[PDB]
Write a protein that binds this ligand. Sequence first.
Ligand SMILES: Cc1cc2nc3c(=O)[nH]c(=O)nc-3n(C[C@H](O)[C@H](O)[C@H](O)COP(=O)(O)O)c2cc1C
Ligand SMILES: Cc1cc2nc3c(=O)[nH]c(=O)nc-3n(C[C@H](O)[C@H](O)[C@H](O)COP(=O)(O)O)c2cc1C
Ligand SMILES: Cc1cc2nc3c(=O)[nH]c(=O)nc-3n(C[C@H](O)[C@H](O)[C@H](O)COP(=O)(O)O)c2cc1C
Ligand SMILES: Cc1cc2nc3c(=O)[nH]c(=O)nc-3n(C[C@H](O)[C@H](O)[C@H](O)COP(=O)(O)O)c2cc1C
Lengths: 400, 400, 400, 400
Amino acid sequence: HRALDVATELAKTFRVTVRERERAGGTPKAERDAIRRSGLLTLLISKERGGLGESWPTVYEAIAEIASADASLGHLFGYHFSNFAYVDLFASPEQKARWYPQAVRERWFLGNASSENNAHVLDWRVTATPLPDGSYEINGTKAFCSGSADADRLLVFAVTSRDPNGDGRIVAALIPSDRAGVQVNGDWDSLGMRQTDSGSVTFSGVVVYPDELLGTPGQVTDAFASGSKPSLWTPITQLIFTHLYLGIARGALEEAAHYSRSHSRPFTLAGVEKATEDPYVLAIYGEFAAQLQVAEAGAREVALRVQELWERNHVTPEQRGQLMVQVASAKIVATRLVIELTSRLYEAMGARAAASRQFGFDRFWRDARTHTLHDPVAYKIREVGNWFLNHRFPTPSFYS
Amino acid sequence: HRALDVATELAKTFRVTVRERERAGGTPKAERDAIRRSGLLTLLISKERGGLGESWPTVYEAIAEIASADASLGHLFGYHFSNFAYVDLFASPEQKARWYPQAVRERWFLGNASSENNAHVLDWRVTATPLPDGSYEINGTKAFCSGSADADRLLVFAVTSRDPNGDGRIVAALIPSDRAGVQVNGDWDSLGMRQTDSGSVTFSGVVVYPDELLGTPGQVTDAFASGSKPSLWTPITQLIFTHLYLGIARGALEEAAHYSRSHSRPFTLAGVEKATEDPYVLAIYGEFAAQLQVAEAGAREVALRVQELWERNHVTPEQRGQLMVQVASAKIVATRLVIELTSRLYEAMGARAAASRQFGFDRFWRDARTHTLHDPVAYKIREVGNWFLNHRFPTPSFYS
Amino acid sequence: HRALDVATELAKTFRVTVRERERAGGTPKAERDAIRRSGLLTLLISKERGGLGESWPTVYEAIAEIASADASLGHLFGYHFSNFAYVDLFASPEQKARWYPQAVRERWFLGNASSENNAHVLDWRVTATPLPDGSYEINGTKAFCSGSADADRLLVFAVTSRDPNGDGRIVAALIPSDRAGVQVNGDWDSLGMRQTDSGSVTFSGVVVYPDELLGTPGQVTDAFASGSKPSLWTPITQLIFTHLYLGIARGALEEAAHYSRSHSRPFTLAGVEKATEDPYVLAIYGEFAAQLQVAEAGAREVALRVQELWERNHVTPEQRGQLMVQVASAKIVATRLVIELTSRLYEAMGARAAASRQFGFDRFWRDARTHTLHDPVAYKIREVGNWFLNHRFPTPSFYS
Amino acid sequence: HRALDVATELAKTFRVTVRERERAGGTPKAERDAIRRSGLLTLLISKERGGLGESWPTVYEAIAEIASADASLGHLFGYHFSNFAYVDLFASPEQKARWYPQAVRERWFLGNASSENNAHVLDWRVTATPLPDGSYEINGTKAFCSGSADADRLLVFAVTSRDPNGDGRIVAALIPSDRAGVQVNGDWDSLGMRQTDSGSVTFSGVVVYPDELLGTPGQVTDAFASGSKPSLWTPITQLIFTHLYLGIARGALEEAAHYSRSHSRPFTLAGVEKATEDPYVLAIYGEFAAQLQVAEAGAREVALRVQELWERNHVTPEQRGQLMVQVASAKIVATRLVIELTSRLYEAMGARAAASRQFGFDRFWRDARTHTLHDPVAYKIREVGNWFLNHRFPTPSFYS
Ligand SMILES: Cc1cc2nc3c(=O)[nH]c(=O)nc-3n(C[C@H](O)[C@H](O)[C@H](O)COP(=O)(O)O)c2cc1C
Ligand SMILES: Cc1cc2nc3c(=O)[nH]c(=O)nc-3n(C[C@H](O)[C@H](O)[C@H](O)COP(=O)(O)O)c2cc1C
Ligand SMILES: Cc1cc2nc3c(=O)[nH]c(=O)nc-3n(C[C@H](O)[C@H](O)[C@H](O)COP(=O)(O)O)c2cc1C
Ligand SMILES: Cc1cc2nc3c(=O)[nH]c(=O)nc-3n(C[C@H](O)[C@H](O)[C@H](O)COP(=O)(O)O)c2cc1C
């Protein structure tokens, strides 16, 4: 439990300043460096390679703990492990032997540049065009590039173009953020998740060398269509999001409870002597704490299943599909819970909790309301319904 | 329909600037002056006294229309009529014969200084010390003094102190906001309702003259206990709040719909080609628009009953109680609706509606979330339940 | 108020026996005859023609009152007026001159045979094949033939076949239920609505004469698609259903409250002395009574609009579409309300309310759960959402 | 897995006949004997004592599985284990060394006579009069005596009377159901749970011998008041109820999906071609299936903790209190889930699922609606809220 103690202490520190930092937005550089010093970025790197040799259940618990104190830092930390999972699922033995000790020594905090801001989410326009000696040149602009500021390496996705071995193939690469031609645009100005640096990144003639490629071009599509082990990336990542939402929920509920204990006034018109004894205050806390207990317990079980399949040589389509259904189910419940809780808890605290903007409790709703839109919950619900009613597992992709 | 056309045009101009104004907070002086020039502040003053001679249904519709454009201006406008209602219900005919033509000629926008920030509501510390001529000296600081800035008159409440005829009796008065010793503090920095100037007002040896007093000391308490006509102030005022919530709800729905038609991207992963044809987008708009239609139609009926009883010379506790139950019911439904809709509509718009803070759609949730806490909806629910189950009307108070 | 008093007295008598009668199912002949004797079946026939010359608001109020006592009799009564509305919207002047005095003299209680049990609700197979002199022969089986038992006339729909003047045209006719070849099958055995006689009817060579046809074949298709006056039939009929749901809701809430007052035990483990003072019991009654008040007040406004347009010579598509949206909205809210209330009120009553089957409170849920499925509320929601978001009124049909 | 295979095959046979059997009510003797022959009643008896030596996780899974097929048999089975848990927690080793091999040999199916029908749940009036030889005489009538028909032993609770060492002290005993003076009244006629035989039992001069007593008089009260290991009986039992609700929920969902696949018709008015592709049908299954997955996963974690503490020699009030909070939270979520889905799934099936009573789907709602009233969920919610807000564990009792 040493790693979780480390995460708990980080979270405590972040809570002290999150109110003022998230107002300003921008890059939480000091807090990112605190995460570097903690070593937790190396949780899944083997001890032999210099990491902590820890497990996914620990990573998930740490994500929720940090997110409960600062949702932006929880998101950055969580997405680091989504990026790491992708790297680990496609990297060669040579790449792991080079990169992982380097990630330990240089304290890599990974960012990504994957999504785009085109007509729809499947309209990708960032191209990878072949060069001599096996290299590729990346051109175009990516959107929602979380952790792209102060990132040591960027996980980047592009589609092959002018490629004699096949156009339209997805290439993934891990490249230095300061590689020439990479421009992080710094245009993130959001309702919530204000310190995740999820703005755009423009690629102008950016060179990617063969030893930076994560598999051959198109390999990710073959792995997902086949149900190869890399198809675990989506359930892993969607469960990361789930833990952000449960962390935010728990942080909001605890912050509200402290306010209620120390600051709410009883509704003496109704004969209440203390707000903490009000039957309707107690019902609000009870209803949301109860849902939270069940969701947290369920999320621990699914995190253990992630670890179990992570360790297998092969995961069957049924095993992967069942995990994705469990993860989607957890994300659905956690989305509804955090969105309702962060708004309705004001009713347990009273008017003065909103009358002073500086109390800042709305940060929880703003953070949850922003992130829960990452991909539409309505279609996670449809996927679970299509599974239960029609016995169809979701189609492996970057979103399901 | 002339008055409502005037309200509609005011609201149109307010929508142009509200995003920028509400950020700054402070006093919306230009907009208050526009309301002054419109004549609508005189809606309920009889034509004989120079007013518009209009009805509460008209007032309520105008409140909801303005609130749908700018919740702070809707609140200020609405609370002006709560203040006016108190004056009308307690002032003498001679006082009205003087005050109402003056309010017309001088374009009075009324403010109030009633509530306080003590161990609980109704625990009042602003004192009224009797002077030999029948005046009172007012001392103390009032909290949540909506519309206290730029107010032509303040409706003020105090409790008697050092009073040979009984301490602790509530006195009320209508006084100039620049009476010697009145300090409007401007200490309002809130989550939402940011331009309602609901900070505090400090009374330092403020003299209130006998022709400014509204009834006799304790008369408001006696009227409450009797459930007589002056106790209509509470259902009238609670239905004003109800129309703020309905106006915010309608403004949010229409604003989101504009975004959905103009900006939302179709979820092509699921085969949808137009966001406006997405079955789940359509279901969100349908669920909330349907509830809004029913709540608005119901509110019109209650508003008609307010006007009926407003015109009566005498009102029974049974008539007032039945009206209060109907008002509480409307407020309950409007409260649930606006709080759910202003949060969940993001799910119909997509991530970019939250990713771009400057869209500013969160203003609707912030305004509704702030104001709905004025008094706890849990006890409005208990009051309707106690009536339905036990045939007990709500105990008249400043909140029920 | 005479008609409503008559309806209230009928509902009083129905409440005495409904628990016993609905167990058995089958035809409530005695109660149908009491409705015949009351004269209320003639509410919408002019006084000149021997009817009551009343209005739709009166009809809707009577439907809700009767439904609150006996949902099956409320359904039968309401469907009689849906059938009458169709007749009145399509009948020729000479048909009305003969039928309406006859309906008064003979105390007609109308039923219908319209829907079918094929692959979907558009798949009609009951045919109308030409006979000499403009007659038609009807062949096939109808489903959900409400009020088909003990009916003085049946409103029957068929599609033309082997017709030189056009196949597939919808014909409607008003015929005697004992005409040769009409077989009411008596196979209604339902979860709720158990005495509506909504079973199947089989037509074997049934002759229909020109003076029984309601307009020419295909006229209803043109009238609905063009928005001519008969397009009011659907909002009229869907608002009849809405008043069934509001009646059941009010009846269930009043029956539960009586049980709570006289039988529920206090949860003394928590220090409650009387169940009627329990804060959570009170909150259940409060939530549902509040929603019921708002829904009922709203429904009264829409009922008035039905009458206003009923008296118009021409109704525009805007007027008809806005009315249909208001009716759909009322139906959506009433549907959610009655389905939740009839199940959740058990929590305000306690285990003995379900443990003693003979209490029979589940009749309310059974009746509402059955009838609310008449057409899917999900698509009423979509219709309201398509209007709000896309400014598209519902396309007139038998369901919208 | 052997035990769960046996439970699954029992459930499969129960599904074939439940629709017909539960209509009649009365005692499901053939199915109770099948459970006797299966050996599963011995799940928690050690192999050393002739039992299966299984764990609470297995018992809970078997309870949910059987309940998904027949809620009454699931309840009888689950309450047998509540009865057994009480015996295990209070009987002496010497008693258990005799009783448990006997229960294996004679295939004992336990019932109980505990609750009463007095002014409130704390008002007990069945008395235990001490006789000079250490025996007692039991007199009075118990209510809700689940599994009292065809019971091999009854777990009976009484309060001491005529007792020189203290009246009102709770005694418990395990006695034959055919002991002279025991009259099972057979008056159970309920909305749902119709074959649980939970009617009244009358004791007339019933002798209880010293070697049948469970502990000393008042010992259960002492154990509750100290939060010691015997007070685990309540979280154990409340988690049994939770698994009944999860089982009913899963059974209802599966039955509905079979109808949706086989019988539901597409809503062609809206262009749907297959009901199983309808977006709103899919959303209903997805929402409820997702909540079920999360609740089932959380329930498994809590079941493991039950086993952990069950194996401890001593349990602290903190351990017991934390467990009770986790169990209460699971019960709250499962209660809301089962009550909502057993009613709402009709909207995914269509009207004919209710219009054909013989389909019998309402059994799920009737069973769930009946059993969830066992104790009020509002106070489970208050208990979780009092823990979260005020750090107060539930006061141990027969309900918390
Ligand atoms: C936006 C807003 C405006 C308010 N305006 C007034 C007002 O004009 N006059 C008044 O007496 N109280 C006003 N109140 C105060 C409430 O009546 C109540 O006293 C207070 O909100 C309760 O505080 P609590 O819930 O934190 O204990 C206002 C409250 C809010 C949130
Ligand atoms: C706070 C936030 C962070 C996001 N971070 C990433 C990211 O790191 N990588 C990525 O590919 N997409 C990221 N996304 C994008 C989503 O996958 C998706 O592209 C976006 O929500 C679609 O926007 P729309 O709903 O307006 O069409 C992020 C979205 C949000 C709201
Ligand atoms: C289906 C059902 C079965 C029950 N079985 C038992 C039982 O076996 N033993 C027991 O002590 N109480 C049993 N109870 C009763 C509860 O402990 C409690 O006394 C009862 O639900 C309270 O009734 P009330 O809410 O009407 O006041 C049962 C209740 C129901 C509804
Ligand atoms: C209680 C009840 C009464 C009904 N009465 C009629 C009726 O009188 N005339 C009619 O055309 N349809 C009637 N319907 C049927 C609907 O128009 C529609 O055909 C049916 O509810 C759809 O069935 P499904 O959802 O199982 O496919 C009735 C339905 C119910 C549940």
